[PDB]
RNA sequence: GGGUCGUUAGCUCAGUUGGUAGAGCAGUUGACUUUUAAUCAAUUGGUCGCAGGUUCGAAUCCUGCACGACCCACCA
RNA sequence: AAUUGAAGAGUUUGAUCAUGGCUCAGAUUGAACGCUGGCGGCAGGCCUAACACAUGCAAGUCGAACGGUAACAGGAAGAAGCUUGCUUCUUUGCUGACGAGUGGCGGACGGGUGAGUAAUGUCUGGGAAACUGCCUGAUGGAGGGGGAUAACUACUGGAAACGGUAGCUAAUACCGCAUAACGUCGCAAGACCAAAGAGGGGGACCUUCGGGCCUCUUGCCAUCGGAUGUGCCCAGAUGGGAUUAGCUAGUAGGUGGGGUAACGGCUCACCUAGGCGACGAUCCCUAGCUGGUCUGAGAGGAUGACCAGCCACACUGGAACUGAGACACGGUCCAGACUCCUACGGGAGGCAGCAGUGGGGAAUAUUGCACAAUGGGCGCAAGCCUGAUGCAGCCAUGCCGCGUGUAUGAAGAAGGCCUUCGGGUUGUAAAGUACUUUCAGCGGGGAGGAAGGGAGUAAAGUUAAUACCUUUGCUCAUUGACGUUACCCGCAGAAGAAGCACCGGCUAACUCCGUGCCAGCAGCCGCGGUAAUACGGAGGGUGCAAGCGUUAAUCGGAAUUACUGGGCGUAAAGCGCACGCAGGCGGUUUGUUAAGUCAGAUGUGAAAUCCCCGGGCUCAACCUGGGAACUGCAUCUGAUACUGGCAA
């Protein structure tokens, strides 16, 4: 269910640094970034209409692993949903449990984010789960348990986590690494740049 | 068939023989009326017509005449012999 | 003869009973006059898990339909004062 | 469904080989009946053994015909093999469900061509002591000149290296035995004494790996797919799942039945002669000459290597050596795969008389066992007898 | 009348196969297609690439 | 599993009384010609479906087999 | 809070714009096939042969209806071996219980298939000439008599099945006599009609010592209700063909008789000679219908497998009985075909009930467990049956979730691969290395589904009664099919778990080597003739994911059937033109009416399903409360400008 493949190679493909490989190491510059998808990197595309729209649909899953599939199902559900289906849409993606744990700072990438849900680790109202697509419900906390706490990893884990920009919709103890939610994530905070602006349009067909 | 319901059989068999017979006879007693009727013996009519009144109620009384019939065999009969009474 | 039993719902391994007044010559979830509120054994310790429209179940019963054993019980759970 | 068998007495596997045309399927007969007056009930009579209405064309039993007979000791599970040429490849695969046979030949003739090969290829299957019962007694009452056939019997298992002193050779009479005569009756209650004494009760593993040679599919119209073989080796219950192995590329199969013959059984054991349904599989699926045996326990191969013996023509063999591209049958207890002759460096042809090593190259893979031995026929009759040594 | 796929078959005369519909353009009348990998028109033999179709196995090793 | 008849160059297929493998088109290759086609010629083809037995001589006859087809039982 | 929703491209031509065909990008399925594959949850799993069938099972129960007791454990009179009450054992229905049988109830329910049926079916909403077991309420009764018969004995036909004849006997079986009212016939007076008894406990009374008797639970009988189910009618809607235009003679209706629960040509008799049709009759083809499903911007079109309602059928065709109800799946009678047994004279059987097999086909499963829970039939109850149902198994068939790991990592290696053989790429990828260990695998803890029922005991009603019985607490033992359960803990080591289609443009992503209009490819345009971005393979890369492609069917794009929203001087398309019936359309004024129309209220539009907002499974799928909608239709009352009817 998981790419789980070359995670800088994804980079390269967009040229865009998606913080796959973000880790220990803060910059990638170990690959000739930028110019690099495959073999024939050397042709620069004359890139059509629907290419523009794939390269952005298959950016914005490549940034959190989303299946095609999968990726739809949060897409219709985003759409049955009032306002804009544009921000309806990523703060679904943003609202990933996962994704929520990589914000509190739990993990330098999110490769480990959805690795830590599955391994009996992390723990939201006292209840442990296992599901990463998890919509992490309003208002709540989530933490890591005593058994699997900080085993050489969780604290260093934290520590690209101190050189991050830190959302705003949430916080955390970081004492027990006991993080802390929030409001829902807003658009203006999020994306930076990335267009959902192309992704409604091609669904859209 | 293959069932302990084989005796259902035999004594709707049973049944059916008794209930043959009771109908049989009333509707002799009524058949001797409308033979009277087509001469038109007011006098033995209405006797055969109060001779068939126990057994023709008895009948839907017991489960074989459905009662509304049996009203009908009182009410239409006696507006053949009252028609001529 | 009418009667008031459960309708048997709910997913697998998860019943969810439907207190329902219906005919006994029906089938189970077959056709029913109309399902007078519900029941839940298995709903977990919280808000709901029992319903009994109590007011047509008087009448209902009022008329000539007999309540099962279970949503006799249940009545007996349901307690017309706890 | 009917019958549940009961484990009373360990399942012996016997029955009757000989040359054709002398009255085996005649004494089979008489053995039954004879536990239908010492034991509770066993008989067999000649025209119900004849399953086929062509046998009842010709006499000839040419669909190997099993009957049932226990003695007040053991249980045993008969195989009335034809002594027709012509039908002795049916003879190796119901060899593979025997341990010991009655060398049925009729005593007017003594051991002639189809007796004598009866009898090598039942070294080649696994079937070591045969006591032999010498059949029609009773229209040659001369002791002379018989007391040549049973000296010269002795002398034929010896050139098979059967030692023959031990295994008592026995003059009978099938006629009047099953027709009422107390005296021919009791001959074969001789045989009814012998067959517990001699031949002890080897130990067939029922702890061992599931094995089962497939005897031959049945369609049983009601309940599918039901095929007998030997369980060798093992036990088997009604809801485990074993595999197809041999000719086609094995896969598994659920076992949903155990009988035997025709009476119910809950669980296989060792050295039984059973039949077990298999759950969801087509008539031509699993195929008559394949193997049926416990997944994950058994690979095959193709190839192999043997020490080969050629029949002379002293003995009944063919004419002259066979040249490279000559394809004959190898039997391993149930399988009829022809096999090119692979000869080595040096001997490009094999003399009907030679006992030289060469490699083997069949045409079908088997689950390969190095020692599993086979009888090797083609042109009518036996052209070899050999055993597996290496398999590459 | 449909089109025997692969480079290369080994149908003759009885050959029971499948058929899955597909017209050719190519010849007139034809609008079929024999299953390559089928009950007896096996997996085209020495093929790498598109193995579903043709009914090609995948690579001994 | 049984017993009865088939299988031969690229193709259609030969080879009677057992004497020694090819015929007509061709697949293809050169020529005519708008390319040609046709056709004239050129090259070629089987370990006689696998081999063995009797054979001086076996594609012919004696069976056992892979690939086909009919009836016979196939009834733990 | 309850529909915020619509895209195109390639292709005729030297090239252009139109018209107009073709083709695809998407999604869906009761799908299969190929290649591949780790597990789990929740659904689905014969659409073809309505073809045929071995075996097991699918509906039996009540002794609180009765005579009985052939069985089973006891009681009792006796007996015998011999440890004279230790036990052996014949009697015996006296008990607990219970075959066969008589009787009562159900078996018409639930289950299955969709052949047939084009409308006697369905869906929608009104209507009146209807019947109604069990359940519930209420008004009275529940008196007294009679003749057989099953069982069981005996003789006995027949291969068997199935019987026959002569004796024996009961009942809540059957039949009279009586008695009846607000019941039935009748305008009325009058006339006529019903039945059933058992079970528990017990003081006085009383024992022909069976019991009469007191009392309670219950059942039976008759009348009026109600509920429910069901029958019935009317209008409308509910597929194709006009290359089917005519159809019919109980056919259209009256009266009279008969018949049904009910009215009726439902059926006869006489008479009338009509009735159905161009807003499509009849005949033929095809077909289960609806809520819904798929798709679609919506409108529609197609479909309607499943869940659910209704309808039809039960080997084929027909008929009838018992019964409240069938004109009947596991009922009968007969004929026929197909099978089985045969003693050859004669019978026996219907898997389209759950599994299962043969055959068919591209195509789909266990001859599992259990009535634990729900429902149903019987019964006082306990209990018994239940292939409905609740589960387990088989299969990637679908929907959803997770995992096969993560981090560091330049030596920018090995090798594959391309080359301007500089270099690049594969490539942080791997290795090495730091940690983590989900699910599987093994070893241990462990919910919830379970409400009851049973016995004992307490109190409250009832009654002569502290008894019997009903209601409500306490207590004990408990009741688990699934079940190696959900879930949790531990152990081990990254070890067991990634492939599949494609890369000319459409439409995401490139070259080399080789084969030479050969092999080949393909959805359309189309490519291949010695240097192929499409063929075969290699490297790289893309899409997707336990799935990916192919085939097929449905819809959309298709505004190429256009109502919403198209065309007709020439691209297909104005009849050659005119008169003219039905039909359609209709100037202007006043007034009225209120069918159309509009507004409001009400009944219904079933539920499940789609939509919104919440809740619970670790999340989801799914289950799911409440609401919304169900666009419709019927009824009443209003507005009445407009269309229309009617008057001048
Ligand atoms: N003298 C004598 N002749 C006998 C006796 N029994 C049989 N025969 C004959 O022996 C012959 C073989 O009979 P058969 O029963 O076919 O034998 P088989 O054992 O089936 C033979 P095949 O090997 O062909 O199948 C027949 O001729 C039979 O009549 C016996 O007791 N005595």
Not at chain 2, 61 to 69: E, F
Not at chain 4, 333 to 342: F, P
Request: glycine share 8%; hydrophobic share 35%.
């Amino acid at each position: 269910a998981r790419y789980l493949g070359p995670k800088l190679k994804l980079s390269r493909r967009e040229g865009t640094d998606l913080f796959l490989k973000s880790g220990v190491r803060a910059i990638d510059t170990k690959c000739k970034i930028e110019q690099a998808p495959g073999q024939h990197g050397a042709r620069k595309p004359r890139l059509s209409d629907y290419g523009v729209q794939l390269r952005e649909k298959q950016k914005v899953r490549r940034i959190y692993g989303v299946l095609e599939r999968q990726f739809r199902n949060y897409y219709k559900e985003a759409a049955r949903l009032k306002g804009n289906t544009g921000e309806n849409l990523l703060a679904l993606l943003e609202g990933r449990l996962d994704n929520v744990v990589y914000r509190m700072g739990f993990g330098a990438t999110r490769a480990e984010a959805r690795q830590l849900v599955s391994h009996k680790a992390i723990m939201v109202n006292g209840r442990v789960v296992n599901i990463a697509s998890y919509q992490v419900s309003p208002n709540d906390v989530v933490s890591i348990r005593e058994k699997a706490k900080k085993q050489s990893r969780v604290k260093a884990a934290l520590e690209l986590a101190e050189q991050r920009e830190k959302p705003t919709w949430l916080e955390v103890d970081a004492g027990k690494m006991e993080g802390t939610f929030k409001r829902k994530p807003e658009r203006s905070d999020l994306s930076a740049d990335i267009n959902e602006h192309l992704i409604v349009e091609l669904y859209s067909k | 068939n293959i069932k302990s319901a084989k005796k259902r059989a035999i004594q709707s068999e049973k049944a059916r023989k008794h209930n043959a017979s009771r109908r049989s006879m009333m509707r002799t007693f009524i058949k001797k009326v409308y033979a009277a009727i087509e001469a038109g013996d007011k006098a033995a009519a209405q006797k055969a017509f109060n001779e068939m009144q126990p057994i023709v109620d008895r009948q839907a009384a017991k489960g074989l005449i459905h009662k509304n019939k049996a009203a009908r065999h009182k009410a239409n009969l006696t507006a053949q012999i009252n028609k001529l009474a | 003869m009418v009667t008031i039993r459960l309708a048997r719902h709910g997913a697998k391994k998860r019943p969810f009973y439907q207190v329902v007044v219906a005919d006994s010559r029906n089938a189970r979830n077959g056709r029913f006059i109309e399902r007078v509120g519900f029941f839940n054994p298995i709903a977990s310790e919280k808000e709901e898990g029992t319903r009994l429209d109590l007011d047509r179940i008087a009448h209902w019963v009022g008329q000539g339909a007999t309540i099962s054993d279970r949503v006799a019980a249940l009545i007996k759970e349901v307690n017309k004062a706890a | 469904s009917k019958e549940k068998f009961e484990r009373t007495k360990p399942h012996v596997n016997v029955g009757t080989i000989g040359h054709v045309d002398h009255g085996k399927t005649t004494l089979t007969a008489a053995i039954t009946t004879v536990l239908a007056k010492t034991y509770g009930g066993a008989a067999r009579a000649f025209d119900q053994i004849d399953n086929a209405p062509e046998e009842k064309a010709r006499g000839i039993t040419i669909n190997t015909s099993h009957v049932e007979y226990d003695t007040p000791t053991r249980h045993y599970a008969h195989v009335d093999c034809p002594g027709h040429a012509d039908y002795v490849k049916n003879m190796i695969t119901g060899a593979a469900q025997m341990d010991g046979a009655i060398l049925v030949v009729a005593a007017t003739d003594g051991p002639m061509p189809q007796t004598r090969e009866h009898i090598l290829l039942g070294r080649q299957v696994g079937v070591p002591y045969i006591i032999v019962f010498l059949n029609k007694c009773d229209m040659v009452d001369d002791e002379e000149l018989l007391e040549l056939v049973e000296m010269e019997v002795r002398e034929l298992l010896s050139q098979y290296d059967f030692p023959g002193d031990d295994t008592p050779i026995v003059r009978g009479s099938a006629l009047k035995a099953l027709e009422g005569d107390a005296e021919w009756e009791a001959k074969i209650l001789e045989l009814a004494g012998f067959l517990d004494s001699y031949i002890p009760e080897p130990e067939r593993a029922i702890d061992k790996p599931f094995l089962l040679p497939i005897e031959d599919v049945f369609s049983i119209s009601g309940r599918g797919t039901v095929v007998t073989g030997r369980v060798e080796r093992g036990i088997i219950k009604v809801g485990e799942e074993v595999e197809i192995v041999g000719i086609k590329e094995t896969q598994k199969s659920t076992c949903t039945g155990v009988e035997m013959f025709r009476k119910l059984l809950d669980e296989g054991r060792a050295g039984e002669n059973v039949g077990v349904l298999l759950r969801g599989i087509k008539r031509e699926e699993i195929e008559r000459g394949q193997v049926l045996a416990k997944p994950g326990t058994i690979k095959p191969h193709t190839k192999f290597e043997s020490e080969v013996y050629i029949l002379s023509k002293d003995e009944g063999g063919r004419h002259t050596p066979f040249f490279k591209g000559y394809r004959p049958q190898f039997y391993f207890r149930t399988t009829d795969v022809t096999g090119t002759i692979e000869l080595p460096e040096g001997v490009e042809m094999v003399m009907p008389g030679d006992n030289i090593k060469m490699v083997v190259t069949l045409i079908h893979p088997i689950a390969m066992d190095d020692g599993l031995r086979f009888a090797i026929r083609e042109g009518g009759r036996t052209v070899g007898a050999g055993v597996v040594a290496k398999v590459l | 009348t449909s089109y025997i796929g692969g480079e290369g078959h080994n149908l003759q005369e009885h050959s029971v196969i499948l058929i899955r519909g597909g017209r050719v353009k190519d010849l007139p009348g034809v609008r079929y297609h024999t299953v390559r990998g089928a009950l007896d028109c096996s997996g085209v033999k020495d093929r790498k690439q598109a193995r579903s179709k043709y009914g090609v196995k995948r690579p001994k090793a």
